[PDB]
């Protein structure tokens, strides 16, 4: 349903990480790289690719 609504100020992010911590990069849940490199908000909205 991302096609039929107008958002505000879309942001894109990009980096390289190991294969295991791709599950680790999620809102709320803790993690080493998630606590030292990139901490998402607890109510983050968007899609991770």
């Amino acid at each position: 349903k991302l096609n039929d609504l107008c958002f505000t100020n879309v942001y894109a992010d990009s980096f390289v990480i190991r294969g295991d911590e791709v599950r680790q990069i999620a809102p709320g849940q803790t993690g080493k790289i998630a606590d030292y490199n990139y901490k998402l908000p607890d109510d983050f909205t968007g899609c991770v690719i």
Partner: protein, 319 residues
């Protein structure tokens, strides 16, 4: 109080069909709440019926204005003026106006149009002046007003001769007193006090309520249309379910609140009806039932969502 009927279906679920299905699961809460409000709505009309439909037949005010030295121009309806509202009565809507569907909410109109209420009040006023207390108990019997007043004195223990000996003195005081009352209503910013609060309190509940829909209630969005578009049904329910639970709460509080308020108004209506039957139709022996002091008679008046009573009382000035 203003008849308010709120449709359980439209408020909670909103326009969307998907939202409606969850409401069906809950049961007859939707249906039950609407019934309670309708009961309240009937009471406000019915209450009105009890308080003002005290007379079988409207009595036209006599064309002759002879009042035995009593001037009733303020109290009685004016033909020249539109809407048949008395100077007191015509102005009150003035005063009330100065003091004073859209969404999910329809405010239903009352069974008795303000115009009709005006006629009822006039009939009682016309009935009291022309026929004394005879109209209350049966077919109205014409009586001289001076003579009616004579009977009133006898009830409170002051001999009738007393009225007749200084009718002129009494008439002037009464006329002056009525004039004082007219000025008092207009001059005071807030004399109606109690009547005003009934209207303000009801308005606050609705705003609070109208304001209540905006509240998040622990959901990602406060809008059913907005939440539905953003979320699918399958995992939709957790947020769709809750908003519904929270909103149901708003209605129940409002519905419960209305009943308590309605009950208070009903007691007031019945008290007010009692005064109307007890004081307007005949003299009341009970002390401090009608105003203050010894009571001679009362004249009913009409305001929006209220009844204003003018009480005529006898007090001993000098000792």
């Amino acid at each position: 109080m203003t008849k308010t009927s709120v449709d359980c279906t439209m408020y909670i679920c909103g326009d969307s069909t998907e939202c409606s299905n969850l409401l069906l699961q809950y049961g007859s809460f939707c249906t039950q709440l609407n019934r309670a409000l309708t009961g309240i709505a009937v009471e406000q009309d019915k209450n009105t019926q009890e308080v003002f439909a005290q007379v079988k037949q409207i009595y036209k005010t006599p064309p002759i204005k002879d009042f035995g030295g009593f001037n009733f121009s303020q109290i009685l309806p004016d033909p020249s003026k539109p809407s048949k509202r008395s100077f007191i009565e015509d102005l009150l809507f003035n005063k009330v106006t100065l003091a004073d569907k859209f969404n999910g909410l329809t405010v239903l109109p009352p069974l008795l149009t303000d115009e009709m209420i005006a006629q009822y009040t006039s009939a009682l006023l016309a009935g009291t002046i022309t026929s004394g207390w005879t109209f209350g108990a049966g077919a109205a019997l014409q009586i001289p007003f001076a003579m009616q007043m004579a009977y009133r004195f006898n009830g409170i223990g002051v001999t009738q001769n007393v009225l007749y000996e200084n009718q002129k003195l009494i008439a002037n005081q009464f006329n002056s007193a009525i004039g004082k009352i007219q000025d008092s209503l207009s001059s005071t910013a807030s004399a109606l006090g109690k009547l005003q609060d009934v209207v303000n309190q009801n308005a606050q509940a609705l705003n609070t309520l109208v304001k209540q829909l905006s509240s998040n209630f622990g959901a990602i969005s406060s809008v059913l249309n907005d939440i539905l578009s953003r979320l699918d049904p399958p995992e939709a329910e957790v947020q769709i379910d809750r908003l519904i639970t929270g909103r149901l709460q708003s209605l129940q509080t409002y519905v419960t609140q209305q009943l308590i308020r309605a009950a208070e108004i009903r007691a007031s209506a019945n008290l007010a009806a009692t005064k109307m039957s007890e004081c307007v139709l005949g003299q009341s022996k009970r002390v401090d039932f009608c105003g203050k002091g010894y009571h001679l008679m009362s004249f009913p008046q009409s305001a929006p969502h209220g009844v204003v009573f003018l009480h005529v009382t006898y007090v001993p000035a000098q000792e």
